[PDB]
Amino acid sequence: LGLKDFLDDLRLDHYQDLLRELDELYQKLKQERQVPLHGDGEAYPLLTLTVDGGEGRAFEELPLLSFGLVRVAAVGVKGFRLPSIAHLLPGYEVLRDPKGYLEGLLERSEESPAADALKTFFRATGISLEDLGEYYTKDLRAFMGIFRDVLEWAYLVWGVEKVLQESYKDYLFIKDGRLAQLGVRESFRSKLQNYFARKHLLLAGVTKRSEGLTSLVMARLFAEARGTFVLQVPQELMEKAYRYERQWNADLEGAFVMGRRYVARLLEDTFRPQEGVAIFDLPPYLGEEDAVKVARSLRAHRSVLYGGSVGTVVEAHGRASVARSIPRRMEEEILARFRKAFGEDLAKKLTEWLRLAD
Amino acid sequence: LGLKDFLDDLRLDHYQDLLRELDELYQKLKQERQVPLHGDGEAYPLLTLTVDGGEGRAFEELPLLSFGLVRVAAVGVKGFRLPSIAHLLPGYEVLRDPKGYLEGLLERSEESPAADALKTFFRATGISLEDLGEYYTKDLRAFMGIFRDVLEWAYLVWGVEKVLQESYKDYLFIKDGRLAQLGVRESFRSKLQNYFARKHLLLAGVTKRSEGLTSLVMARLFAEARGTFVLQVPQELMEKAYRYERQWNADLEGAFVMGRRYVARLLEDTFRPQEGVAIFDLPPYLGEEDAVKVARSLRAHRSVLYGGSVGTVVEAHGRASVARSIPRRMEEEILARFRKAFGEDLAKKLTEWLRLAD
Amino acid sequence: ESPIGVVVSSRRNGPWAELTLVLTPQELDQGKRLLLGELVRVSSGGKDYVGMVLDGYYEPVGRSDPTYTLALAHINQVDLEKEDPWARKEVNFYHHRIVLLGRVVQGGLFAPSTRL
Amino acid sequence: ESPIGVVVSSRRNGPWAELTLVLTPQELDQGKRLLLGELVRVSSGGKDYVGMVLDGYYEPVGRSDPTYTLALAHINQVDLEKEDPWARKEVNFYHHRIVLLGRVVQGGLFAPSTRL
Amino acid sequence: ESPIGVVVSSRRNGPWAELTLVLTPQELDQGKRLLLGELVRVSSGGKDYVGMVLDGYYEPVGRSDPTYTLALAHINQVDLEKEDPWARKEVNFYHHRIVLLGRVVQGGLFAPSTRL
Amino acid sequence: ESPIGVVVSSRRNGPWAELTLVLTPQELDQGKRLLLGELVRVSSGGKDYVGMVLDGYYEPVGRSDPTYTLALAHINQVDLEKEDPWARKEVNFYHHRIVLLGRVVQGGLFAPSTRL
């Protein structure tokens, strides 16, 4: 093989420099205050929201001949749930005209729950399309993520203001991700904060793992500390994490969490260093007691599936997932409808192109 | 799996104009000379270049606890090769704070082969670190990509300077990938172009497929194509491909091939639509006769290993690849070396950190 | 009155035609079970065959790791009957194998085995 | 007056030649079945053979998880036929085995088996 | 009074019913073992059966390569019990096989084997 | 006077050497075939042998799913010899197995089997 080729001028000093910041951060974490959970408490129901999807065959490399997919599903305590919003993304139209599709989707408001939710969210939060900036129009890859994030927020707000207008106030809403929106103007974040602030809505976002350095050091801390407990993440640790994440993926600039991070260990015993640890964020109008109650509810609603999970999160994700044969069946359905709408002579060429295109 | 959530109001009207433009492009391609390419004849030898590099485990998640690999190998004829360069990009070092690593490596007193190649390339071509721009300092991924591309260019120039002073004029240099530089200044591109024009170097870039390639419409019209032939991609196809690339990927401002592009068909029976087709580009200072000579050489060096590959390209790639045992052995050897230079408890602390995560 | 489980396979094994059955977590928790050697009724296309439960075993369903899940839940003393409905529902399944013996026809004549 | 299914394999198993047959969801819904031991006609390159259905079994076609799909549909009380026609079109398959006894020769003697 | 291990399978093997048992690293460290041929009591749905340890073997649990892990630890002179507690906490598993002989019923009788 | 197929394997099966043969789709469409028990000539290192065709079977070549491809084509009712040549060209393969009896030497004397 010849591994000696990379063994020319090995350097070993950056490791010495690195083994000072981690030590300092560990010492800082040792200075925190731990709030244990004694297998009890005053908890209230949860309501998780998540968005999933996939892509059609060859869409990644030849999007002008394929399509996209997005589905949103939610599950809450007592077996309650909201209707699922789904949408199909035409690769060709979006590729050839960014912003030429979102406006039409907003205007239709005829039968698509996605368009209905977008209209409802915009009209309710007073958010303007100029706020989203040019990040989603930079290219298709950015636009897809922007659309998915906006649709997640729109589903949350639309459900809140359409289905649960008086019974929504007793539920803890869970988000499958950090409480941060990246790639949009600060107007969007300010409007979201105000809407969740005036409403006093109980919202807590679960990040799981994507958190790298934070989990690295928190597992070490748990190696010494014992029991189920929670502790606020130090501000210096959060700032260093943001600096590292920015220096790694500049596109993530501005995605700071609108709140503070808490870490609660859900499982007393585990077979691996980083199992049964929950990282969640809270809105600025939530205090230490609110964080304690959120941690207690999460611990009560824990699961042992994926090395310790919040349970409702995994159930909602499983419900909202997209079948891997769904893209193929959708492609066949699209071809059938194209035939039945335009004619038969115009489908043979499309099928031949598809056959010649892997 | 709960289909029909995507079937509501498909709105597939655009497929009509999609296929219309596809048929127009096929019609345009129809009128291109397909010179017969029967193998027997005279041709140049080849000197392929290929770059590759592995990575440590969880490089993306924690690039501050891993490293990087970048290797370049050139294969000539049968055993007429040149020394292979190996470089180790530390995760923490300057990857966490660029703008200093390049200067340090250029001023490397030890003068490792990679640094020597970089210095020789800069000196010969007259391209300073200023013309590179600030893209390579935007983030770690951009720095890695720009470093890989510039290292391959430096390897090519260093080989053409220090190992082939005279015979380099009777060699058909084949460079993997399209002839283009992305994320570098037009000044850098023009410097490379004019240096190549002055050197009168025999060059051609060979690619199979993804990035975005609508030029693979060649798959159609290959039926009853009468075996091999040489063709030049139409300007309409080139413009459409460039526009689609800049629409989808973005940041592909520099992707235009520094010259014209020819598409060939090495084989005559493939079992699949897109086998045995080579897309090789040429610099502006090479005429159709040079294109024919290069096509004959490529046909002479044809293979069937990967479904009609150029043979020498795959041979070079095999010798320039990186396995996983190499990163693992590098990890263990660097861990061992750390002890001699910096205590023992520090090494044990680092080992405990590694055990606790990645 | 209602089906016991969901049939998920069928085949011919030697001279007898068999078909696998799966009992879901909901049915297993309601307390429904099949006794080895029992006689049951199989409906297929308007005809009523006769079956005899032969075998019974445990096999994972879907993408799951019952061994790891159960071990991890055990070390933490998690009462699956009260704390982890999702893990219980993911790992609670059971398979049975049934053989068709014939079918009563007309005034009572019993036609052995089957060809369909 | 058209093929019952699609042939997807062939082989020589001992002194006899077999060939696998697959019944698609359309033919299964229309009501077309094959009784074990039935005699069928096999055409291969313009010649007519005589075949006998030997076996029959269920096997997934493509990248599918019939057990998971059926179990989930049963759990959610989802009636496949009326509610998820797209989910009943990817598990509704069935395989068969056929053996070529020989070729009938006009004005001559039945030619046993086959060397082709 | 506490259960020994965690049952992670069950099936009818020939004329006898049997189930698989796993001893977690914690239990192994505490010194809990099972002797081949030993008699144990199995509780299942409000009934008490009589079991008998039949087999014993080592098999990996989860996503791990115990051979590679142990070989590397031995090579690097690492003492797993002290220096690397986490490496020893994912390979210290052990399996067992238990057969249900019957169950004691009423006032001194014994119903052999089992159908559930 | 051109090779019928391409040899793609070989081994020492008991006391007789053997090698596998593959018929490509182009040859299969031209009409070439091999009859079981046929005698064929094998060239290897400048020496001609005498081989007998022993067995024949269908096995996929490359990364393909012949079952799914053919079933989908049948469902969509597309003639597989006039509409989708690129799909008919990747499933039309077929394997043969051949045994080397020996080679003739000198004045017609038969050298049995082969040590090479």
DSSP B271-322: SSTT-SEEEEE--TT--HHHHHHHHHHHHHT---TTSS--SHHHHHHHHT--
Closest listed residue to residue B231, CA positions, set B258, B264, B260, B206: B264
User: What is the rounded CA–CA span in Å between residue A216 and residue B65?
Assistant: 11
User: What is the rounded CA–CA span in Å between residue A181 and residue A146?
Assistant: 9
Any CB–CB contact under 8 A between C102 and chain E? no
User: What is the rounded CA–CA span in Å between residue A135 and residue A183?
Assistant: 6
Cα separations (Å) of B220 from B277, F19, F85? 12, 38, 13
Interface of D with F in 30-59 (CB under 8 A): none
CA angle in degrees (0–180, nearest 5) for A205-A210-A211: 70
Asked whether the beta carbons of B229 and B35 are under 8 A apart, the reply is yes
Asked whether the beta carbons of A142 and A133 are under 8 A apart, the reply is no
Could you identify the residue written with the tokens 């210096």? A236
Task: Please give the structure tokens belonging to residue A255.
Answer: 């995605």
Mutate to test the interface with E, among C68, C78, C91, C96 (most CBs of E within 10 A): C68
Task: Please give the structure tokens belonging to residue F97.
Answer: 């197995």
Strand partners, A204: A174
Q: F84: distance to nearest CA of chain A, Å?
A: 8
CB contact under 8 A, F84 and A355: yes
Closest listed residue to residue E88, CA positions, set E70, E100, E104, E103: E70
CB contact under 8 A, A305 and C87: yes
CB contact under 8 A, C24 and D58: no
Mutate to test the interface with F, among B220, B224, B269, B271 (most CBs of F within 10 A): B271
User: What is the rounded CA–CA span in Å between residue A11 and residue B104?
Assistant: 13
Q: Looking only at Cα atoms, what is the longest distance across chain E?
A: 61
User: What is the rounded CA–CA span in Å between residue B69 and residue B80?
Assistant: 25
Q: 10 Å Cβ neighbour count for B73?
A: 24
Mutate to test the interface with C, among A77, A266, A304 (most CBs of C within 10 A): A304
User: What is the rounded CA–CA span in Å between residue B341 and residue A181?
Assistant: 45
What is the phi/psi pair of residue E110, to 5°?
Answer: -155, 110
User: What is the rounded CA–CA span in Å between residue B70 and residue B322?
Assistant: 9
Q: 10 Å Cβ neighbour count for B281?
A: 24
Cα separations (Å) of A264 from A36, A246, B93, C101? 9, 26, 33, 58
User: What is the rounded CA–CA span in Å between residue F81 and residue F68?
Assistant: 17
User: What is the rounded CA–CA span in Å between residue C104 and residue C81?
Assistant: 43
Strand partners, D49: D103
User: What is the rounded CA–CA span in Å between residue C36 and residue C52?
Assistant: 8
User: What is the rounded CA–CA span in Å between residue B327 and residue B59?
Assistant: 11
- Extract long-range pairs of B323-326: CB within 8 Å, 24+ residues apart: B323/A1, B323/B54, B324/B54, B325/A1, B325/A3, B326/A1, B326/A3, B326/A6, B326/B54, B326/B69
Query: Alpha helix locations (H) across F10-113?
Result: 25-30, 66-76, 85-88
Asked whether the beta carbons of F49 and F98 are under 8 A apart, the reply is no
Asked whether the beta carbons of B146 and B182 are under 8 A apart, the reply is no
Integer-rounded Cα Rg, in Å, for chain E is 18
CB contact under 8 A, C36 and E12: yes
User: What is the rounded CA–CA span in Å between residue A175 and residue A118?
Assistant: 18
D72-87: burial string, b at 16+ Cβ within 10 Å, e else: bbbeeeeebeeebebb
Nearest C-alpha in A relative to F76: A332
Q: How many CB pairs under 8 A join A and E?
A: 8
DSSP at D38: -
User: What is the rounded CA–CA span in Å between residue A16 and residue B356?
Assistant: 18
What is the phi/psi pair of residue D38, to 5°?
Answer: -65, 155
What is the phi/psi pair of residue B70, to 5°?
Answer: -145, 115
Asked whether the beta carbons of F56 and F48 are under 8 A apart, the reply is no
Task: Please give the structure tokens belonging to residue B229.
Answer: 């032939």
Nearest C-alpha in D relative to C59: D67
Asked whether the beta carbons of A183 and A251 are under 8 A apart, the reply is yes
Q: 10 Å Cβ neighbour count for A300?
A: 17
For helices A14-30 and B345-356, give the axis angle rounded to 10 degrees.
70
Question: In a 3-state reduction of DSSP, which class is residue B344?
Answer: coil
Could you identify the residue written with the tokens 């000696």? A4
User: What is the rounded CA–CA span in Å between residue E56 and residue B209?
Assistant: 54
Closest listed residue to residue B176, CA positions, set B358, B16, B315, B1: B315
CB contact under 8 A, B326 and A1: yes
CB contact under 8 A, F67 and D22: yes
Task: Please give the structure tokens belonging to residue B154.
Answer: 């430096």
Query: Which residues touch A42 (CB under 8 Å, ≥6 apart)?
Result: A293, A296
Q: E76: distance to nearest CA of chain B, Å?
A: 10
Interface of C with E in 72-101 (CB under 8 A): 73-75
Interface of A with F in 328-357 (CB under 8 A): 355-356
Q: 10 Å Cβ neighbour count for A37?
A: 19
Q: 10 Å Cβ neighbour count for C77?
A: 10
Could you identify the residue written with the tokens 């490509």? F24
User: What is the rounded CA–CA span in Å between residue B143 and residue B151?
Assistant: 12
DSSP at A83: P
User: What is the rounded CA–CA span in Å between residue F63 and residue F72?
Assistant: 17
Asked whether the beta carbons of B246 and B169 are under 8 A apart, the reply is no
C55 CA to centre of own chain: 10
Method: cryo-EM
Task: Please give the structure tokens belonging to residue A22.
Answer: 């981690």
Query: Alpha helix locations (H) across chain B?
Result: 15-30, 101-106, 113-125, 140-162, 186-199, 235-248, 288-300, 312-319, 325-341, 345-356
Query: Which residues touch A46 (CB under 8 Å, ≥6 apart)?
Result: A76, A77, A171, A172, A173, A174, A297, A298, A301, A310, A312
Closest listed residue to residue D55, CA positions, set D104, D16, D90: D16
Q: B164: distance to nearest CA of chain A, Å?
A: 23
Asked whether the beta carbons of E16 and E99 are under 8 A apart, the reply is yes
For helices A326-342 and A345-356, give the axis angle rounded to 10 degrees.
150
Q: Which residues of D touch C6 (CB under 8 A)?
A: 70-71, 73-74
Task: Please give the structure tokens belonging to residue A308.
Answer: 């310790």
Q: How many CB pairs under 8 A join A and C?
A: 36
Q: Looking only at Cα atoms, what is the longest distance across chain B?
A: 73
CB contact under 8 A, A18 and B92: yes
What is the phi/psi pair of residue A43, to 5°?
Answer: -115, 160
Could you identify the residue written with the tokens 């949350």? A156
Strand partners, F21: F7, F96
CB contact under 8 A, A271 and E90: yes
* Cα distance between the two ends of chain B: 36
Asked whether the beta carbons of B204 and B174 are under 8 A apart, the reply is yes
CB contact under 8 A, B269 and F26: yes
CB contact under 8 A, D115 and F35: yes
Asked whether the beta carbons of D101 and D51 are under 8 A apart, the reply is yes
User: What is the rounded CA–CA span in Å between residue B357 and residue B351?
Assistant: 10
Q: A268: distance to nearest CA of chain C, Å?
A: 6
Nearest C-alpha in D relative to C22: D71
User: What is the rounded CA–CA span in Å between residue A16 and residue B59?
Assistant: 19
Burial of A266 (0-12, 13-18, 19+ CB in 10 A): buried
Q: Is the dihedral of CA F3, F8, F12, F15 positive or negative?
A: negative
